[PDB]
Design a protein around this ligand. Structure first.
Ligand code: A1H6N
Ligand code: A1H6N
Ligand code: SF4
Ligand code: SF4
Ligand code: FCO
Ligand code: FCO
Ligand code: SF3
Ligand code: SF3
Ligand code: F3S
Ligand code: F3S
Ligand code: CL
Ligand code: CL
Ligand code: CL
Ligand code: CL
Ligand code: EU
Ligand code: EU
Ligand code: MG
Ligand code: MG
Ligand code: NI
Ligand code: NI
Lengths: 263, 581, 581, 263
C-alpha cells in the first residue's frame, strides 16, 4: 500500500529541525520513514548527491505533482539575488518555488521556516524571509520552535497521514493541538509565580527549590508551545524544568524582544 | 587552463570539470567541483560553502549573557558546542570563574555531544558510502548472524533478526518507493562489503537511528532540551538539590539516576555496535588507508578540550590535548595561542567578503564580516553558477591559516596530536587498531583513518562521560552542590572594555569564539569553526585547504557517479552552517 | 485420622503431614498442608488463606462513585481489574451507559493488565519452578545461542550475550550473597531443562523484569499511573482532544502514539520470548501434562469479558467467552447468570466467618462478611498453628460454588470454555500448540497446561490490544470523542434503592462485584474473586476446591522440598489478597 | 565488594509497593537486585518457600544482625490476636518485631506501612496499625503513596547506598527530597486553578482543555508527594495529567477524608 510522498528541502538553517525529527520516540523516526511516509528527498539523509539528487528532485515533483507534502526547514534569503543560499548553482528560492508549486500542502518546520529565526534577527544581513511571505498560494502549516518538540513533529505527521487532513490552525497557521495554549498556561512552576516565589539569582535557595523563573526573564507568559505539557526528549525535561526561563523560541521575532534575562 | 604547485600538489584545471551540487549527507549547503585528467584522476579540487547567515553581524550589540543562545544556532548538529565556546569566551573577557560542578556538567554536555554526533555521522551521514544497502537484499541471514557474532558480543545478532530486517527492506523497496535510497550509487565497484556485511551494516543503521535519541536525554536533564540546550554565563542553570525540601524542583537523585542509565547504554552501543562496524569497514576497504591523505601527513591542529581543573585551560588540565604540527614534523608538536595575532588568521581573497586589503590575513580580534557576493565569471551569471572561478572568489567560507599554514582539524588531527605528544591511552588504542587491520601507522592518515579515529573518539568520549559523572557524584557526596557563580552577573561589575577567547574541540575539530565587550554590549564577535578550516578556499599564496588537498590525486571509477568524492568529503564530517555562520 | 470420597478422590489425612507456610512467589499470604503416604504421594491437601482486610465491610456507607478506588486496593498485582468490576457494578445498579470510547479504553486497560500480569507471572513467579538458575552457570553460551535461535527470531541471542548474562550470574553468586536464589530447590530431580535451556530461560527472566515496566505505560496514559490507575463511574476521566486548542491538556495524538508504540513492543516480546519459552518448558516437562489435573477435567467456569458492544454484556458482545462445564461434560457449556440465587453461592462452614446457617451457601446479594477467627482443635494453639484442622474452619477464604459444584477458574478454564464453544481462534491456537508438543488435547488439563494457556492468553490479549486501539482511532477519525456519561453522576438522579453486578475475567479467572445502593450509599458490596474459587476450602458436602484437587495424588521426590506442590500451586497464579479481600 | 543486605517483609497488603518497585526505570529493578543491594528475603520473588524460606529469614537476620535494612510492605493487624495475618502459623507481628530488632534502619514502603491505607479505613475491621505504632525504637523512613512512585523508591535506595546515609526527613519521617512539597505546589494545572478555570463535569469542554480538577475533588492542595514533578512510569503521566483529581493517597487517613469527588 503506497506511502504518502514527502519532499523535505533546506534553505538557510542550522539543521536543528531535522535533528529534532529524528529524536522522535513514538513513532520512531525509523518507523515514520519505513512505514508512514515516503521521504523521497531530504538533503541531510539521502544517498544521492549532485546530479543524482537533482534527478530525484525532478522526478518526484513531476511524478507526484499535486500529491506530495513539502516539508521546509530553514528559509530563503532575498539578499544578493538569493545567492546567500545556493543550490545547484542557483538561488535556493527557485527550488522552494518549484517544490511549492507541486505540493498538496506545506509544513514550515521550526521558527526558521515559520518566522525567520536567528538569521532574521537584527540586522538580518541576508534578508532571510519566512516561507509564507514567498509562497502565497498553498496551505502552510507553521510548526514553530527552535527546534519544535520531536514528538510534536511526529504527532503532526501522524495526524496528517492517519486522519488524511491538515491540523486545524490558529490565526497564524499553527496547529491548535500543540500551540493553542501558552507555556505559562501549563507550567508546573505556576504555583510559585502565583505566590511571588521567584529565583532572583542563579543557584540561589529559590532555584534549588524549583521556584518560578519570571524574574530571570522567562518568556513563558507570551509563548505558545507544548513544552510544559508534552515536554522534551520523551518527556524527560523542558527549558524551565532544568532551570532556565523560556527564551520565547516558538514566537515570531523572539530574538529581538529584548535580553532573555530582562522583562 | 593553468597549473601551479603548492604543498606538494600540482593544481591543474585542464580536463573535464565535474560539479557536485548539492553535496548531501552533510549538514547544510556545499558545492564541490573537480577537474579530472585522462586517467580519471583528480588534478583540481574546489571546496565551496553555498550558504551564509551572518551570526557575527547579528551578535553585535547583544548582551554578552545572551550570546550563547544566538551562537548555539550556528549549528543544530553540533548543538551546544557553540554555546560552550560562547560562555567560555564571555567568562574569559569579564574574568568569571565557574564552580567545579558547572565545569563538570559542561564536560558532560560536550562528551554527550561527541558520542551522539559521531554515532549519527557514522551511520546516517557517512555509512551509505561504504554499505551497499540494496546489496543487503542478496544476503544470507544465517551468514549475516555468523559474521556479526564473529565481530561482537552485541546481543542482537539472531538469524531471525537479520531475516526480519531484510524482509522490512524488501517490503520497503518493493513498491519502488525507495525514499532515501532512490538513485543511489548502489552496485558501484568501490562497494566492497560482502552481502552479509551490508545486511549487518544496514541493521545497525536502523539500530543507531533509534538509539541516538536516547543519548541526548543527558542534555535534556542538564540543559532542558535537545537540540539546543540552555546554558548560562557563570555556570549552568540546572541547580542541584539532593536531600532538601523541593528537590523535586531541581537536579535530584532520580535525575542523576536517569543520566547514569543513559551513560551505560551509550557506552555499550558504541563499544559493541559502532566500534566493530568501523573495524569491519576497515577490513573490507584497506585501500582507502592510502586515499585522501591530504594535509593529514603535513599540517594538523587541535586547540584541546575538556578542562578537568575548573577554569584552567592549560595543558595540565585539558583531557583532550592541543597542539599544532606543520611541514610533516610530528616530532615537534607546537603550542597554540589564540590571542597571538601571528597564529590564527583568516583570508578572504578567495571568499565572498570585503577586507580593506584582501592580500593579508586578519586575526579574529581584527576580524571583519562584510559579505560581498562577487563570483566573477562563472560561465553563467551571478544567479547561475555553472563553473566557480577558483582563481577569484568562490565560497562563503573564510580561509583560516595557522602561522600562514593550511591545517586539517578534527578527529584524525586530534588523534595525531595526542599520539605524538605521547598520550598513553591514544598510543595504545591507535597501535592496537592498526595492528588489528594489519596496516602501518601511516594508514591512519587517510579517508579510512578519519572514520576509524571518529569511532575511537566516540569510545573515548563514552568513557569520559562516566569519569565526569563520577566526579560530579563525588562532589555531591562531599556536600559541594554549587552550579553558578553570580558575583559578576550584573553588567555594572564588568570592565568597561574587555575581550576574551573561548575555545574547545567540537566533534569536527578546533573551535574558537573571539569576543570584545564594550559598555555592556558585544562590540565584536568572531567565530572560526572546524569546517571553516577544513572546507577553506585558497589564500593569496594559492595554498589549498584540507578538503581540496584530500581530494587531490584521487582516482574515480565512474566520473558521473562521485562516490570517491563523497567518501573523502564525508570522512571529514562537513558542517557547512558551522563553516559559514 | 479420617478418610472420605469426593469428586473421584480419596481424602485421607492419615500419615505424615507436610506444611508449606509461607508460600512464596505468590501475591499475599497462603499456607498449604498435605498428607503423604509411604509412597510419597499426596492423599490430602489443605488450602489456607492467611490474610484478611475486610473491604466488603469498609465499603459500607461510602459513596458508590468512590468504590472503585477502595476495591482497586484489593490487589496491586491484578491492579485495575477490581476498579473495572466496580464501575461495571455501579453502572449496572444505577442504569448508566458509558460512551463507546470509554468502553474501548476500559478494554485496553484490561488487555494491558492481562499482558503485564501473565508475563510477570511466567518469569518472576512461576519461572524458577521450571528453570534451574544455578544450573545456568554450567551452560555453554554458544549452545545456548543455538538453542534460542532454533526456537525464535528474537534478536537477543548472541553467544556473547549469553556469556555476559552467565558472567553476571557468576558475579552475583561469587560473594555468597545468593539473594532470591538462596536455599532454593536447585538440583532437585524434577528440574529437567538442559543447562543451555536454563541459561536461555534465566536471560529471559532478566529481559522480562526489564520489559514489564514498559507495558503499564498504557495504564499511565489512560489512567494516570500504574500500579492503581484511576477510573470513573460513567466512563474514564482521560478526556480526548485531538485537533482543538488545549489538546496538550488531554489525550492527544502524541499520547495515542505512545500507546501504539507500547502495544507493538508488548506483542513482539510476548510472541518471540514468552511463547517459545512456554513451549520449551512443555517440551522438557511433558510428564507435567498428566500432573495437577484437579477439577480441570470436571468443572470449569468463566463469566466472560471484553464486551465489544458498549454496555452489552451478552454472548454476542463478550470477546472472551463465558460459560460453565460440570461433570466433565465439555459438550454442554452452560450459561451463567450472576443474579440467579441458585448459581453462585459462598459457604463458610470451613472458613473464618459467621453465617446464620453455615450448612447452606449464600448468593452475594445475600452475602455476609462477619469475620470469626476460630481454628478450633489445631495441633498447637490459635496463635501458634502446627496443623490446621481441615475438619473445621481453616481459612480466611470463603468457599464459592456454582449450582453447588466446585469449579476451577482462570486461563485454562477460559481456554476450555472457548475451545468447546467453538471459538475459531482458540481452537486453532490450542490445536497448534498441542500438535507442536505431540500431546493430546487432554494434556492441557494439567499443571503444565495452566502455564501453556496463560502464555497463549498473553498472546491473545496483545492482539486484542491492537484491535481495541484501532477501534478507538476509528471513532476519533469520525469525530466521536466522548469518554464519559454524566447524566446520572449526581446521587439525586439514582434509584433510591437498586442493585447491580459487575463482572469480568481477571488474569486469574472469573471476578464479580455485587453492589446494593440505598439512599445514595453502599448498602452491601460483596466480592467473589478468582482465587476465592481456586483456593476455596471445603463445603458441607466435603467437596474440595481447585487447588486441593490439583494437589491430590501428586508424587513428591523429596518430602521436605515442596517443589511439586509449588509447581502446581504457582500454575494457578495464586492471588491471596484478592482471594480474601 | 559485598552489597547491603535488605530484608523485605509483607504484612496485610495488596503488593502494590513491590509492583511499583519493579517498575523502576533508572536504575532498573534488575540492576538494583543484582548490583546495588542484596535482596536477601522477599516473599513475592524468592525461590525458597516454607521451611526453606524460614531458614533464609533466620540465617540472614542472624548473620547480618545490626547490618540489614528492613523494608516493610503492608502492616500488622492487632485484631484476633494478630491472626488476621498469619506467617508460619503465628501472627505476622512476631516476624515484624524479630526483623525490626536486628535492622539498622527500616523503610516503611507505601501508605500501608506508613499510615494504614485501605484496610485501616473506617471501620478498620482488623485493627490494621502502621509500623511506627508497633516499632518505637528504630529509625523509620516513611515512603507513602498507594503505591509510591517507582523511581522515587529506587532513588531513595540509591541515595542510601551511594551516600551511605538515611535521607533527611520531615517531622513525619518522609524524605524531604520527594515529600517536601505538595502536588498542588508543582501542578501544571495551577494556571487554571489561579484563573478559576475548572472542570465541572466529566468530559466537559474544560476537561478537554486540561483545566484544574479542584471542583471534581482534587486533593493535591493537601497532599505531599512528587507526582506533579517526577511523574509516573518513567515520566509518562500522573493522576491529574490523565484527568482524575489527586485522591490524596500519600496522606495519613486519605480514605476517610470524605468522598474523592467532594471538597
Ligand atoms: O521461522 C521463521 O519464522 C523464519 N525463518 C524461516 C526459516 O527459518 O526458513 C528463518 C529464516 C532465516 C533465518 C532464520 C529464520 O528463523 C529463525 C527462527 O526459526 C524458528 C523458529 C521457530 C521454530 C523453528 C525455527 N527454525 C529454526 C531456524 O530457522 O534455524 C526452523 C524453521 O523455520 O522451521
Ligand atoms: O570475545 C569475547 O569478548 C568474549 N568471549 C571470549 C571467547 O571467545 O573465549 C566469548 C565467550 C563465549 C561466547 C562468545 C564470546 O565472544 C563473543 C564475541 O566474540 C568476539 C568479539 C570480537 C572479536 C572476536 C571475537 N571472537 C568470536 C567468537 O567468540 O566467536 C573470537 C575471540 O574471542 O577471539
Ligand atoms: S517559570 Fe516561566 S512559564 Fe513557568 S510559571 Fe514562571 S514565568 Fe510562567
Ligand atoms: S488539578 Fe489539583 S493539584 Fe492541580 S492545580 Fe488543580 S487542585 Fe491543584
Ligand atoms: N563539530 C562541529 Fe560544528 C563544525 N564544523 C562546530 O563547532
Ligand atoms: N487476577 C486476579 Fe486478582 C485474583 N484472584 C482478581 O480479580
Ligand atoms: Fe530548526 S533549523 Fe535551526 S535555527 Fe531556529 S528553527 Fe532553524
Ligand atoms: Fe502498597 S501494598 Fe497496596 S494498599 Fe495502599 S500502599 Fe498498601
Ligand atoms: S524556549 Fe522554546 S523550547 Fe519551549 S520552553 Fe520556551 S518555547
Ligand atoms: S492520588 Fe497519589 S499518586 Fe500522586 S497525584 Fe495524588 S499523591
Ligand atoms: Cl523569528
Ligand atoms: Cl527515484
Ligand atoms: Cl491511611
Ligand atoms: Cl516538617
Ligand atoms: Eu526458522
Ligand atoms: Eu569471543
Ligand atoms: Mg567567522
Ligand atoms: Mg467476598
Ligand atoms: Ni556543526
Ligand atoms: Ni490479584
Amino acid at each position: 500500500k503506497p506511502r504518502i510522498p514527502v519532499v523535505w528541502i533546506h534553505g538557510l538553517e542550522c539543521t536543528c529541525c531535522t535533528e529534532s525529527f529524528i529524536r522522535s520516540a513514538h513513532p520512531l523516526a525509523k518507523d515514520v520513514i519505513l512505514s508512514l511516509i515516503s521521504l523521497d528527498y531530504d538533503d541531510t539523509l539521502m544517498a544521492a548527491a549532485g546530479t543524482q539528487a537533482e534527478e530525484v528532485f525532478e522526478d518526484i515533483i513531476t511524478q507526484y505533482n499535486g500529491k506530495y507534502i513539502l516539508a521546509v526547514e530553514g528559509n530563503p534569503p532575498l539578499g544578493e539575488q538569493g545567492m546567500f543560499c545556493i543550490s545547484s548553482g542557483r538561488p535556493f528560492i527557485e527550488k522552494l518555488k518549484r517544490a511549492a508549486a507541486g505540493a498538496s500542502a506545506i509544513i514550515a518546520w521550526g521558527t526558521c521556516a515559520s518566522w525567520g529565526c536567528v538569521q532574521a534577527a537584527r540586522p538580518n544581513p541576508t534578508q532571510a524571509t519566512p516561507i509564507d511571505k514567498v509562497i502565497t498560494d498553498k496551505p502552510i502549516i507553521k510548526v514553530p520552535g527552535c527546534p519544535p518538540i520531536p514528538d510534536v513533529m511526529s504527532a503532526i505527521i501522524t495526524y496528517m497521514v492517519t486522519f488524511d487532513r491538515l491540523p486545524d490552525v490558529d490565526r497564524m497557521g499553527r496547529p491548535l493541538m500543540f500551540y493553542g495554549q501558552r507555556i505559562h498556561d501549563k507550567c508546573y512552576r505556576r504555583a510559585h509565580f502565583d505566590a511571588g516565589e521567584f529565583v532572583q539569582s542563579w543557584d540561589d535557595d529559590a532555584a534549588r527549590k524549583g521556584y518560578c523563573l519570571y524574574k530571570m526573564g522567562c518568556k513563558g507568559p507570551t509563548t505558545y508551545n507544548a513544552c510544559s505539557s508534552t515536554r522534551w526528549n520523551d518527556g524527560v525535561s523542558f527549558p524551565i524544568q532544568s532551570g532556565h526561563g523560556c527564551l520565547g523560541c516558538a514566537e515570531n521575532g523572539f530574538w529581538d524582544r529584548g535580553s532573555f534575562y530582562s522583562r | 587552463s593553468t597549473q601551479y604547485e603548492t604543498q606538494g600538489y600540482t593544481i591543474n584545471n585542464a580536463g573535464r570539470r565535474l560539479v557536485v551540487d548539492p553535496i548531501t549527507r552533510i549538514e547544510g549547503h556545499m558545492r564541490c567541483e573537480v577537474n579530472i585528467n585522462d586517467q580519471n584522476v583528480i588534478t583540481n579540487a574546489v571546496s565551496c560553502g553555498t550558504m551564509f547567515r551572518g551570526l557575527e553581524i547579528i551578535l553585535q550589540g547583544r548582551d554578552p549573557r545572551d550570546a550563547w543562545a544566538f551562537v548555539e544556532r550556528i549549528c543544530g548538529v553540533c548543538t551546544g558546542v557553540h554555546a560552550l565556546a560562547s560562555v567560555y569566551a564571555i567568562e574569559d573577557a569579564i574574568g568569571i570563574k565557574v564552580p567545579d560542578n558547572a565545569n563538570i556538567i559542561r564536560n558532560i554536555m560536550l562528551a554527550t555531544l561527541w558520542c551522539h554526533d559521531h554515532l549519527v555521522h557514522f551511520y546516517q551521514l557517512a555509512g551509505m558510502d561504504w554499505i551497499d544497502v540494496l546489496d543487503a537484499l542478496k544476503a544470507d541471514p544465517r551468514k549475516t548472524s555468523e559474521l556479526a557474532q564473529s565481530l561482537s558480543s552485541w546481543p542482537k545478532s539472531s538469524p531471525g533478526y537479520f531475516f526480519d530486517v531484510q524482509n522490512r527492506l524488501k517490503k520497503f523497496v518493493e513498491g519502488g518507493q525507495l525514499g532515501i535510497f532512490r538513485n543511489g550509487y548502489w552496485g558501484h565497484p568501490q562497494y566492497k562489503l560482502p552481502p552479509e556485511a551490508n545486511l549487518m551494516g544496514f541493521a545497525h543503521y536502523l539500530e543507531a537511528l533509534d538509539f541516538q535519541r536516547e543519548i541526548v536525554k543527558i542534555h535534556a536533564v542538564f540543559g532542558g532540551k535537545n537540540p539546543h540546550p540552555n546554558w548560562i554565563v557563570g555556570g549552568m542553570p540546572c541547580a542541584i538539590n539532593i536531600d532538601e525540601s523541593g528537590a523535586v524542583g531541581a537536579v535530584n537523585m532520580e535525575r542523576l539516576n536517569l543520566v547514569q542509565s543513559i551513560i551505560t547504554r551509550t557506552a555499550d552501543f558504541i563499544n559493541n555496535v559502532m566500534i566493530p562496524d568501523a573495524l569491519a569497514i576497515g577490513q573490507f576497504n584497506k585501500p582507502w588507508s592510502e586515499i585522501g591523505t591530504g594535509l593529514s601527513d603535513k599540517c594538523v591542529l587541535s586547540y584541546g578540550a575538556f578542562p578537568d581543573i575548573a577554569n584552567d585551560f592549560g595543558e595540565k588540565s585539558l583531557l583532550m590535548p592541543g597542539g599544532a604540527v606543520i611541514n610533516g614534523d610530528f616530532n615537534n608538536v607546537l603550542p597554540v595561542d589564540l590571542v597571538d595575532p601571528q597564529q590564527v588568521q583568516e583570508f578572504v581573497d578567495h571568499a565572498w567578503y570585503r577586507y580593506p586589503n584582501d592580500q593579508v590575513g586578519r586575526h579574529p580580534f581584527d576580524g571583519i564580516t562584510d559579505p560581498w557576493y562577487n563570483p566573477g565569471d562563472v560561465k553563467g551569471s551571478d544567479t547561475n553558477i555553472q563553473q566557480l572561478n577558483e582563481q577569484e572568489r568562490y565560497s562563503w567560507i573564510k580561509a583560516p591559516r595557522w602561522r600562514g599554514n593550511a591545517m586539517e582539524v578534527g578527529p584524525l588531527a586530534r588523534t595525531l596530536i595526542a599520539y605524538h605528544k605521547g598520550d598513553a591511552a591514544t598510543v595504545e588504542s591507535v597501535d592496537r587498531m592498526m595492528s588489528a587491520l594489519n596496516l602501518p601507522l601511516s594508514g591512519i592518515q587517510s579517508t579510512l583513518g578519519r572514520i576509524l579515529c571518529r569511532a575511537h573518539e566516540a569510545q573515548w568520549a563514552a568513557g569520559k562521560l562516566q569519569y565526569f559523572f563520577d566526579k560530579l557524584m563525588t562532589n555531591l557526596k562531599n556536600g559541594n552542590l554549587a552550579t553558578a557563580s553570580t558575583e559578576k552577573w550584573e553588567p555594572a561589575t564588568w570592565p568597561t572594555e574587555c575581550r576574551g577567547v573561548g575555545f574547545t574541540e567540537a566533534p569536527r575539530g578546533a573551535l574558537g569564539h573571539w569576543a570584545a565587550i564594550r559598555d555592556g554590549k558585544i562590540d565584536l564577535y568572531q567565530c572560526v569553526v572546524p569546517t571553516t578550516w577544513n572546507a577553506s578556499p585558497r589564500d593569496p599564496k594559492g595554498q589549498i585547504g584540507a578538503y581540496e588537498a584530500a581530494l587531490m590525486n584521487t582516482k574515480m571509477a565512474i566520473p558521473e557517479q562521485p562516490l570517491e568524492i563523497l567518501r573523502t568529503l564525508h570522512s571529514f564530517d562537513p558542517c557547512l552552517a558551522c563553516s559559514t555562520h
